[PDB]
């Protein structure tokens, strides 16, 4: 998961690096390993830059984001 080059600030479920970085920046001391997909999904949908459909996520998408968060942490 590497950085994309969007011109807009809006993030899509596939922007794994950007979302993971956002979560890390917003919740600096929360251990990503302990986070449940059910909760993370909601936190991502509430991100200011989130610009996708909440229904469009899946476990592969969320695992990618969780792994980026773990890396940033």
PDB file of N, CA and C in Angstrom:
ATOM      1  N   UNK A   1       0.856  -1.221   0.000  1.00  0.00           N
ATOM      2  CA  UNK A   1       0.000   0.000   0.000  1.00  0.00           C
ATOM      3  C   UNK A   1       0.873   1.246   0.000  1.00  0.00           C
ATOM      4  N   UNK A   2       0.933   1.918  -1.142  1.00  0.00           N
ATOM      5  CA  UNK A   2       1.748   3.118  -1.271  1.00  0.00           C
ATOM      6  C   UNK A   2       0.869   4.330  -1.541  1.00  0.00           C
ATOM      7  N   UNK A   3       1.464   5.517  -1.521  1.00  0.00           N
ATOM      8  CA  UNK A   3       0.697   6.733  -1.742  1.00  0.00           C
ATOM      9  C   UNK A   3       0.190   6.896  -3.162  1.00  0.00           C
ATOM     10  N   UNK A   4      -1.040   7.380  -3.268  1.00  0.00           N
ATOM     11  CA  UNK A   4      -1.660   7.628  -4.554  1.00  0.00           C
ATOM     12  C   UNK A   4      -1.395   9.087  -4.889  1.00  0.00           C
ATOM     13  N   UNK A   5      -1.814   9.514  -6.073  1.00  0.00           N
ATOM     14  CA  UNK A   5      -1.587  10.888  -6.496  1.00  0.00           C
ATOM     15  C   UNK A   5      -2.873  11.596  -6.886  1.00  0.00           C
ATOM     16  N   UNK A   6      -3.890  11.478  -6.039  1.00  0.00           N
ATOM     17  CA  UNK A   6      -5.167  12.127  -6.301  1.00  0.00           C
ATOM     18  C   UNK A   6      -4.979  13.628  -6.158  1.00  0.00           C
ATOM     19  N   UNK A   7      -5.774  14.399  -6.892  1.00  0.00           N
ATOM     20  CA  UNK A   7      -5.694  15.851  -6.809  1.00  0.00           C
ATOM     21  C   UNK A   7      -6.623  16.325  -5.703  1.00  0.00           C
ATOM     22  N   UNK A   8      -7.646  15.523  -5.424  1.00  0.00           N
ATOM     23  CA  UNK A   8      -8.598  15.865  -4.384  1.00  0.00           C
ATOM     24  C   UNK A   8      -8.189  15.313  -3.032  1.00  0.00           C
ATOM     25  N   UNK A   9      -8.854  15.778  -1.979  1.00  0.00           N
ATOM     26  CA  UNK A   9      -8.556  15.330  -0.623  1.00  0.00           C
ATOM     27  C   UNK A   9      -9.398  14.115  -0.249  1.00  0.00           C
ATOM     28  N   UNK A  10     -10.367  13.791  -1.101  1.00  0.00           N
ATOM     29  CA  UNK A  10     -11.240  12.660  -0.841  1.00  0.00           C
ATOM     30  C   UNK A  10     -10.552  11.316  -0.957  1.00  0.00           C
ATOM     31  N   UNK A  11     -10.813  10.443   0.008  1.00  0.00           N
ATOM     32  CA  UNK A  11     -10.219   9.115   0.018  1.00  0.00           C
ATOM     33  C   UNK A  11     -11.224   8.018  -0.315  1.00  0.00           C
ATOM     34  N   UNK A  12     -10.756   6.994  -1.022  1.00  0.00           N
ATOM     35  CA  UNK A  12     -11.585   5.854  -1.393  1.00  0.00           C
ATOM     36  C   UNK A  12     -11.086   4.640  -0.613  1.00  0.00           C
ATOM     37  N   UNK A  13     -11.928   3.617  -0.484  1.00  0.00           N
ATOM     38  CA  UNK A  13     -11.549   2.416   0.254  1.00  0.00           C
ATOM     39  C   UNK A  13     -10.227   1.817  -0.213  1.00  0.00           C
ATOM     40  N   UNK A  14      -9.920   1.989  -1.494  1.00  0.00           N
ATOM     41  CA  UNK A  14      -8.694   1.441  -2.055  1.00  0.00           C
ATOM     42  C   UNK A  14      -7.424   2.231  -1.736  1.00  0.00           C
ATOM     43  N   UNK A  15      -7.576   3.430  -1.175  1.00  0.00           N
ATOM     44  CA  UNK A  15      -6.423   4.255  -0.807  1.00  0.00           C
ATOM     45  C   UNK A  15      -5.931   3.795   0.566  1.00  0.00           C
ATOM     46  N   UNK A  16      -5.430   2.567   0.615  1.00  0.00           N
ATOM     47  CA  UNK A  16      -4.953   1.954   1.852  1.00  0.00           C
ATOM     48  C   UNK A  16      -3.932   2.764   2.642  1.00  0.00           C
ATOM     49  N   UNK A  17      -2.879   3.219   1.971  1.00  0.00           N
ATOM     50  CA  UNK A  17      -1.844   3.990   2.643  1.00  0.00           C
ATOM     51  C   UNK A  17      -2.393   5.260   3.283  1.00  0.00           C
ATOM     52  N   UNK A  18      -3.135   6.043   2.505  1.00  0.00           N
ATOM     53  CA  UNK A  18      -3.708   7.295   2.991  1.00  0.00           C
ATOM     54  C   UNK A  18      -4.657   7.107   4.174  1.00  0.00           C
ATOM     55  N   UNK A  19      -5.508   6.089   4.110  1.00  0.00           N
ATOM     56  CA  UNK A  19      -6.450   5.864   5.202  1.00  0.00           C
ATOM     57  C   UNK A  19      -5.711   5.408   6.451  1.00  0.00           C
ATOM     58  N   UNK A  20      -4.770   4.487   6.274  1.00  0.00           N
ATOM     59  CA  UNK A  20      -3.988   3.991   7.396  1.00  0.00           C
ATOM     60  C   UNK A  20      -3.216   5.111   8.067  1.00  0.00           C
ATOM     61  N   UNK A  21      -2.630   5.997   7.264  1.00  0.00           N
ATOM     62  CA  UNK A  21      -1.873   7.127   7.803  1.00  0.00           C
ATOM     63  C   UNK A  21      -2.799   8.059   8.575  1.00  0.00           C
ATOM     64  N   UNK A  22      -4.002   8.256   8.042  1.00  0.00           N
ATOM     65  CA  UNK A  22      -5.003   9.119   8.657  1.00  0.00           C
ATOM     66  C   UNK A  22      -5.404   8.587  10.024  1.00  0.00           C
ATOM     67  N   UNK A  23      -5.636   7.281  10.104  1.00  0.00           N
ATOM     68  CA  UNK A  23      -6.022   6.661  11.366  1.00  0.00           C
ATOM     69  C   UNK A  23      -4.897   6.803  12.390  1.00  0.00           C
ATOM     70  N   UNK A  24      -3.662   6.613  11.940  1.00  0.00           N
ATOM     71  CA  UNK A  24      -2.508   6.722  12.822  1.00  0.00           C
ATOM     72  C   UNK A  24      -2.332   8.150  13.315  1.00  0.00           C
ATOM     73  N   UNK A  25      -2.544   9.104  12.420  1.00  0.00           N
ATOM     74  CA  UNK A  25      -2.398  10.507  12.773  1.00  0.00           C
ATOM     75  C   UNK A  25      -3.486  10.934  13.761  1.00  0.00           C
ATOM     76  N   UNK A  26      -4.695  10.411  13.579  1.00  0.00           N
ATOM     77  CA  UNK A  26      -5.822  10.749  14.442  1.00  0.00           C
ATOM     78  C   UNK A  26      -5.818  10.048  15.802  1.00  0.00           C
ATOM     79  N   UNK A  27      -5.358   8.802  15.820  1.00  0.00           N
ATOM     80  CA  UNK A  27      -5.344   7.985  17.037  1.00  0.00           C
ATOM     81  C   UNK A  27      -3.931   7.452  17.231  1.00  0.00           C
ATOM     82  N   UNK A  28      -2.982   8.344  17.556  1.00  0.00           N
ATOM     83  CA  UNK A  28      -1.560   8.059  17.766  1.00  0.00           C
ATOM     84  C   UNK A  28      -1.094   6.958  18.711  1.00  0.00           C
ATOM     85  N   UNK A  29      -1.823   6.707  19.793  1.00  0.00           N
ATOM     86  CA  UNK A  29      -1.382   5.685  20.733  1.00  0.00           C
ATOM     87  C   UNK A  29      -2.268   4.456  20.865  1.00  0.00           C
ATOM     88  N   UNK A  30      -3.223   4.327  19.956  1.00  0.00           N
ATOM     89  CA  UNK A  30      -4.117   3.176  19.943  1.00  0.00           C
ATOM     90  C   UNK A  30      -3.407   2.072  19.158  1.00  0.00           C
ATOM     91  N   UNK A  31      -3.236   0.899  19.766  1.00  0.00           N
ATOM     92  CA  UNK A  31      -2.556  -0.213  19.096  1.00  0.00           C
ATOM     93  C   UNK A  31      -3.453  -0.816  18.013  1.00  0.00           C
ATOM     94  N   UNK A  32      -3.088  -0.624  16.737  1.00  0.00           N
ATOM     95  CA  UNK A  32      -3.851  -1.136  15.594  1.00  0.00           C
ATOM     96  C   UNK A  32      -4.166  -2.615  15.693  1.00  0.00           C
ATOM     97  N   UNK A  33      -3.237  -3.389  16.249  1.00  0.00           N
ATOM     98  CA  UNK A  33      -3.437  -4.834  16.366  1.00  0.00           C
ATOM     99  C   UNK A  33      -4.677  -5.216  17.161  1.00  0.00           C
ATOM    100  N   UNK A  34      -5.084  -4.360  18.091  1.00  0.00           N
ATOM    101  CA  UNK A  34      -6.248  -4.643  18.924  1.00  0.00           C
ATOM    102  C   UNK A  34      -7.559  -4.168  18.321  1.00  0.00           C
ATOM    103  N   UNK A  35      -7.489  -3.471  17.194  1.00  0.00           N
ATOM    104  CA  UNK A  35      -8.698  -2.931  16.571  1.00  0.00           C
ATOM    105  C   UNK A  35      -9.532  -3.930  15.777  1.00  0.00           C
ATOM    106  N   UNK A  36     -10.843  -3.905  16.008  1.00  0.00           N
ATOM    107  CA  UNK A  36     -11.768  -4.785  15.299  1.00  0.00           C
ATOM    108  C   UNK A  36     -12.261  -4.097  14.033  1.00  0.00           C
ATOM    109  N   UNK A  37     -12.447  -4.875  12.969  1.00  0.00           N
ATOM    110  CA  UNK A  37     -12.928  -4.344  11.700  1.00  0.00           C
ATOM    111  C   UNK A  37     -14.243  -3.585  11.860  1.00  0.00           C
ATOM    112  N   UNK A  38     -15.138  -4.101  12.697  1.00  0.00           N
ATOM    113  CA  UNK A  38     -16.427  -3.443  12.884  1.00  0.00           C
ATOM    114  C   UNK A  38     -16.262  -2.002  13.337  1.00  0.00           C
ATOM    115  N   UNK A  39     -15.335  -1.771  14.265  1.00  0.00           N
ATOM    116  CA  UNK A  39     -15.076  -0.426  14.765  1.00  0.00           C
ATOM    117  C   UNK A  39     -14.283   0.400  13.758  1.00  0.00           C
ATOM    118  N   UNK A  40     -13.197  -0.167  13.242  1.00  0.00           N
ATOM    119  CA  UNK A  40     -12.376   0.559  12.285  1.00  0.00           C
ATOM    120  C   UNK A  40     -13.199   1.040  11.096  1.00  0.00           C
ATOM    121  N   UNK A  41     -14.108   0.199  10.610  1.00  0.00           N
ATOM    122  CA  UNK A  41     -14.961   0.577   9.489  1.00  0.00           C
ATOM    123  C   UNK A  41     -15.687   1.883   9.791  1.00  0.00           C
ATOM    124  N   UNK A  42     -16.248   1.974  10.993  1.00  0.00           N
ATOM    125  CA  UNK A  42     -16.979   3.167  11.401  1.00  0.00           C
ATOM    126  C   UNK A  42     -16.060   4.372  11.528  1.00  0.00           C
ATOM    127  N   UNK A  43     -14.875   4.164  12.091  1.00  0.00           N
ATOM    128  CA  UNK A  43     -13.932   5.266  12.246  1.00  0.00           C
ATOM    129  C   UNK A  43     -13.506   5.811  10.890  1.00  0.00           C
ATOM    130  N   UNK A  44     -13.290   4.921   9.928  1.00  0.00           N
ATOM    131  CA  UNK A  44     -12.892   5.343   8.595  1.00  0.00           C
ATOM    132  C   UNK A  44     -14.018   6.126   7.917  1.00  0.00           C
ATOM    133  N   UNK A  45     -15.251   5.648   8.055  1.00  0.00           N
ATOM    134  CA  UNK A  45     -16.383   6.328   7.435  1.00  0.00           C
ATOM    135  C   UNK A  45     -16.598   7.722   8.009  1.00  0.00           C
ATOM    136  N   UNK A  46     -16.107   7.954   9.224  1.00  0.00           N
ATOM    137  CA  UNK A  46     -16.258   9.256   9.866  1.00  0.00           C
ATOM    138  C   UNK A  46     -15.095  10.195   9.597  1.00  0.00           C
ATOM    139  N   UNK A  47     -14.055   9.697   8.938  1.00  0.00           N
ATOM    140  CA  UNK A  47     -12.913  10.543   8.625  1.00  0.00           C
ATOM    141  C   UNK A  47     -13.372  11.680   7.717  1.00  0.00           C
ATOM    142  N   UNK A  48     -12.861  12.879   7.973  1.00  0.00           N
ATOM    143  CA  UNK A  48     -13.222  14.039   7.172  1.00  0.00           C
ATOM    144  C   UNK A  48     -13.015  13.792   5.681  1.00  0.00           C
ATOM    145  N   UNK A  49     -11.886  13.182   5.328  1.00  0.00           N
ATOM    146  CA  UNK A  49     -11.577  12.914   3.926  1.00  0.00           C
ATOM    147  C   UNK A  49     -12.222  11.682   3.311  1.00  0.00           C
ATOM    148  N   UNK A  50     -12.902  10.872   4.114  1.00  0.00           N
ATOM    149  CA  UNK A  50     -13.541   9.681   3.564  1.00  0.00           C
ATOM    150  C   UNK A  50     -14.552  10.114   2.514  1.00  0.00           C
ATOM    151  N   UNK A  51     -14.418   9.589   1.302  1.00  0.00           N
ATOM    152  CA  UNK A  51     -15.331   9.949   0.225  1.00  0.00           C
ATOM    153  C   UNK A  51     -15.762   8.736  -0.586  1.00  0.00           C
ATOM    154  N   UNK A  52     -16.146   7.672   0.107  1.00  0.00           N
ATOM    155  CA  UNK A  52     -16.586   6.468  -0.578  1.00  0.00           C
ATOM    156  C   UNK A  52     -17.909   6.025   0.027  1.00  0.00           C
ATOM    157  N   UNK A  53     -18.410   4.887  -0.438  1.00  0.00           N
ATOM    158  CA  UNK A  53     -19.667   4.342   0.064  1.00  0.00           C
ATOM    159  C   UNK A  53     -19.354   3.355   1.176  1.00  0.00           C
ATOM    160  N   UNK A  54     -19.925   3.567   2.372  1.00  0.00           N
ATOM    161  CA  UNK A  54     -19.690   2.672   3.508  1.00  0.00           C
ATOM    162  C   UNK A  54     -19.930   1.200   3.176  1.00  0.00           C
ATOM    163  N   UNK A  55     -20.921   0.944   2.329  1.00  0.00           N
ATOM    164  CA  UNK A  55     -21.273  -0.416   1.932  1.00  0.00           C
ATOM    165  C   UNK A  55     -20.203  -1.102   1.095  1.00  0.00           C
ATOM    166  N   UNK A  56     -19.331  -0.310   0.483  1.00  0.00           N
ATOM    167  CA  UNK A  56     -18.319  -0.848  -0.422  1.00  0.00           C
ATOM    168  C   UNK A  56     -17.059  -1.489   0.142  1.00  0.00           C
ATOM    169  N   UNK A  57     -16.937  -1.590   1.459  1.00  0.00           N
ATOM    170  CA  UNK A  57     -15.744  -2.211   2.016  1.00  0.00           C
ATOM    171  C   UNK A  57     -15.906  -3.727   2.056  1.00  0.00           C
ATOM    172  N   UNK A  58     -14.800  -4.425   2.288  1.00  0.00           N
ATOM    173  CA  UNK A  58     -14.792  -5.876   2.425  1.00  0.00           C
ATOM    174  C   UNK A  58     -13.573  -6.191   3.288  1.00  0.00           C
ATOM    175  N   UNK A  59     -13.447  -7.425   3.760  1.00  0.00           N
ATOM    176  CA  UNK A  59     -12.330  -7.779   4.631  1.00  0.00           C
ATOM    177  C   UNK A  59     -10.940  -7.595   4.039  1.00  0.00           C
ATOM    178  N   UNK A  60     -10.805  -7.791   2.734  1.00  0.00           N
ATOM    179  CA  UNK A  60      -9.506  -7.627   2.092  1.00  0.00           C
ATOM    180  C   UNK A  60      -9.115  -6.155   2.147  1.00  0.00           C
ATOM    181  N   UNK A  61     -10.098  -5.293   1.906  1.00  0.00           N
ATOM    182  CA  UNK A  61      -9.901  -3.850   1.934  1.00  0.00           C
ATOM    183  C   UNK A  61      -9.507  -3.399   3.344  1.00  0.00           C
ATOM    184  N   UNK A  62     -10.231  -3.887   4.347  1.00  0.00           N
ATOM    185  CA  UNK A  62      -9.941  -3.507   5.723  1.00  0.00           C
ATOM    186  C   UNK A  62      -8.622  -4.076   6.238  1.00  0.00           C
ATOM    187  N   UNK A  63      -8.264  -5.287   5.819  1.00  0.00           N
ATOM    188  CA  UNK A  63      -7.005  -5.875   6.273  1.00  0.00           C
ATOM    189  C   UNK A  63      -5.838  -5.059   5.719  1.00  0.00           C
ATOM    190  N   UNK A  64      -5.969  -4.587   4.482  1.00  0.00           N
ATOM    191  CA  UNK A  64      -4.910  -3.787   3.867  1.00  0.00           C
ATOM    192  C   UNK A  64      -4.684  -2.515   4.678  1.00  0.00           C
ATOM    193  N   UNK A  65      -5.779  -1.873   5.069  1.00  0.00           N
ATOM    194  CA  UNK A  65      -5.719  -0.646   5.853  1.00  0.00           C
ATOM    195  C   UNK A  65      -5.141  -0.913   7.245  1.00  0.00           C
ATOM    196  N   UNK A  66      -5.559  -2.016   7.865  1.00  0.00           N
ATOM    197  CA  UNK A  66      -5.055  -2.365   9.188  1.00  0.00           C
ATOM    198  C   UNK A  66      -3.544  -2.602   9.131  1.00  0.00           C
ATOM    199  N   UNK A  67      -3.075  -3.245   8.067  1.00  0.00           N
ATOM    200  CA  UNK A  67      -1.645  -3.508   7.933  1.00  0.00           C
ATOM    201  C   UNK A  67      -0.839  -2.224   7.740  1.00  0.00           C
ATOM    202  N   UNK A  68      -1.436  -1.225   7.093  1.00  0.00           N
ATOM    203  CA  UNK A  68      -0.754   0.052   6.899  1.00  0.00           C
ATOM    204  C   UNK A  68      -0.671   0.754   8.250  1.00  0.00           C
ATOM    205  N   UNK A  69      -1.763   0.705   9.001  1.00  0.00           N
ATOM    206  CA  UNK A  69      -1.794   1.333  10.314  1.00  0.00           C
ATOM    207  C   UNK A  69      -0.721   0.692  11.195  1.00  0.00           C
ATOM    208  N   UNK A  70      -0.629  -0.635  11.151  1.00  0.00           N
ATOM    209  CA  UNK A  70       0.369  -1.351  11.947  1.00  0.00           C
ATOM    210  C   UNK A  70       1.772  -0.874  11.563  1.00  0.00           C
ATOM    211  N   UNK A  71       1.993  -0.682  10.266  1.00  0.00           N
ATOM    212  CA  UNK A  71       3.285  -0.223   9.759  1.00  0.00           C
ATOM    213  C   UNK A  71       3.608   1.187  10.237  1.00  0.00           C
ATOM    214  N   UNK A  72       2.621   2.074  10.167  1.00  0.00           N
ATOM    215  CA  UNK A  72       2.807   3.455  10.593  1.00  0.00           C
ATOM    216  C   UNK A  72       3.064   3.519  12.095  1.00  0.00           C
ATOM    217  N   UNK A  73       2.479   2.576  12.829  1.00  0.00           N
ATOM    218  CA  UNK A  73       2.613   2.518  14.283  1.00  0.00           C
ATOM    219  C   UNK A  73       3.951   1.955  14.750  1.00  0.00           C
TER     220      UNK A  73
END
